[PDB]
Amino acid sequence: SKARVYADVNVLRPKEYWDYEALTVQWGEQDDYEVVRKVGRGKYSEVFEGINVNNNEKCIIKILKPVKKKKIKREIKILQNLCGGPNIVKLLDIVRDQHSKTPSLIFEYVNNTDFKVLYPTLTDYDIRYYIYELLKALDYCHSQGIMHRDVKPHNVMIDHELRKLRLIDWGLAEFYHPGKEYNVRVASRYFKGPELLVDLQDYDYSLDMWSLGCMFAGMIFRKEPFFYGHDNHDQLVKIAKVLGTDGLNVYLNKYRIELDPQLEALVGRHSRKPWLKFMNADNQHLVSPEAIDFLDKLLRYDHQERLTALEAMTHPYFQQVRAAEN
Numbered sequence: 498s499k500a501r502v503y504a505d506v507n508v509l510r511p512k513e514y515w516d517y518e519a520l521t522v523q524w525g526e527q528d529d530y531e532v533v534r535k536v537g538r539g540k541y542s543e544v545f546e547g548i549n550v551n552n553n554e555k556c557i558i559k560i561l562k563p564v565k566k567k568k569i570k571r572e573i574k575i576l577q578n579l580c581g582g583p584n585i586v587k588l589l590d591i592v593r594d595q596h597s598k599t600p601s602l603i604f605e606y607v608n609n610t611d612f613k614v615l616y617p618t619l620t621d622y623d624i625r626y627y628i629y630e631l632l633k634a635l636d637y638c639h640s641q642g643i644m645h646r647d648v649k650p651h652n653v654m655i656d657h658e659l660r661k662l663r664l665i666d667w668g669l670a671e672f673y674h675p676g677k678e679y680n681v682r683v684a685s686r687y688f689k690g691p692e693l694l695v696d697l698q699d700y701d702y703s704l705d706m707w708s709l710g711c712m713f714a715g716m717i718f719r720k721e722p723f724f725y726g727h728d729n730h731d732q733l734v735k736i737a738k739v740l741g742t743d744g745l746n747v748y749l750n751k752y753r754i755e756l757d758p759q760l761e762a763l764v765g766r767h768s769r770k771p772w773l774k775f776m777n778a779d780n781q782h783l784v785s786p787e788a789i790d791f792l793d794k795l796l797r798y799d800h801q802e803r804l805t806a807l808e809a810m811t812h813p814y815f816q817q818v819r820a821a822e823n
C-alpha cells in the first residue's frame with residue numbers, strides 16, 4: 498500500500514526536513530510566558546491560557562508530561578515544518594523549567610469553544626464551513642508529507658466569533674515514507690480507521706480522512722461519538738455493524754490480511770445499514786443528499802477508496818462555502 502497523492506514529498510526534500518531526530522532544540526526563555534488559567538488536559542499534557550510578559554499578548558502554554566526526547570522532537574519538527582500553513586496551530590516558542598527540565602510548547606492563542614457545547618449550536622451552513630476549514634489544514638499537512646493521526650473534535654480549536662479554526666496537537670503526527678510501516682496504536686479510539694483495527698501498518702494520509710468522516714457523521718447525525726466501541730475489538734464491530742461485513746471481507750482479501758480468530762469471532766456477520774437510518778427529527782435539518790454522498794465517500798474500509806482532502810474540498814456539498822470564498 499502507498500498513498501495515492503503526495504507519496505514523493507519527503508523523498509524529494511532534503512533529509513533535514515524529515516530527519517527530526519537530528520533537530521537541536523533552541524530553547525527560549527521560560528520567564529517570558531506566564532500561566533494565567535488552566536484550559537485543558539489530556540494523557541500527555543496540561544494546557545493553559547498564558548501571557549507573553551514582553552508584549553502582553555495572550556498565548557497557549559502546553560506543559561508536557563514526561564516524554565522521550567525522540568518524540569518531543571518529532572512534534573517540534575512537524576510544528577516548525579507546518580508553521581504558517583492554512584489553519585495549522587502556530588508554534589511560537591519552546592521553553593523548559595531549568596530545575597526539572599520540563600518542556601512547555603508555546604502557541605498562538607485561540608479562544609476556543611468546547612465542541613460538546615459548540616457543535617449542537619452549528620447551523621447546516623457552519624458545519625459545511627468548519628469542515629471545509631479543517632480540510633484546508635489536512636490538505637496542507639498531507640501536501641507537506643505529514644499525517645496528523647489524531648483527528649478528533651478535541652483537536653480542532655474553533656473561535657466561533659472570528660469564524661476561525663486551528664488544527665492542534667501534532668503529538669501523534671508522523672512523516673510519510675512510501676511503504677514504511679507504522680505503529681497502529683495512534684488516533685483515539687472512536688476515530689481509528691479499519692487499517693488500525695486490523696493491523697494494516699503501511700497506512701497513509703487517508704487515515705485522517707476516516708477520522709474526519711467519523712467527526713462529520715457525529716456532527717450531521719448529532720451522535721458523538723459515531724462509532725462508540727469500548728475497546729479496540731469492540732471498535733471494529735461497531736463499524737462492521739454499519740458498513741456490513743461483506744465490504745470488510747473484500748477489504749481483508751485485497752490487502753491479504755487475516756483477522757485473528759477472536760476478532761473474526763467478535764465481528765460476526767452483518768448487513769450494511771444505509772446512512773438514512775441514522776436520520777431522526779433532531780438531525781433532519783443537516784442530512785441532505787449531498788451530506789450523505791460526501792459522508793459515504795469518506796467512511797470506506799478501503800483507505801485507498803476514500804476521498805483525498807483536495808477531492809473532498811471540491812465535492813458539491815461545499816459549493817456555497819467555495820462560492821462565498823471566491
Ligand SMILES: CNC(=O)CSc1nc2c(Br)c(Br)c(Br)c(Br)c2n1C
Nearest residue numbers: 536537538539544557604607609665
Ligand atoms: C489534550 N487536550 C487538551 O489539552 C484540550 S484543551 C486545549 N488544548 C489546547 C491546545 Br494543545 C492548543 Br495548541 C490551543 Br491553541 C488551545 Br485553544 C487548546 N485548548 C483549549
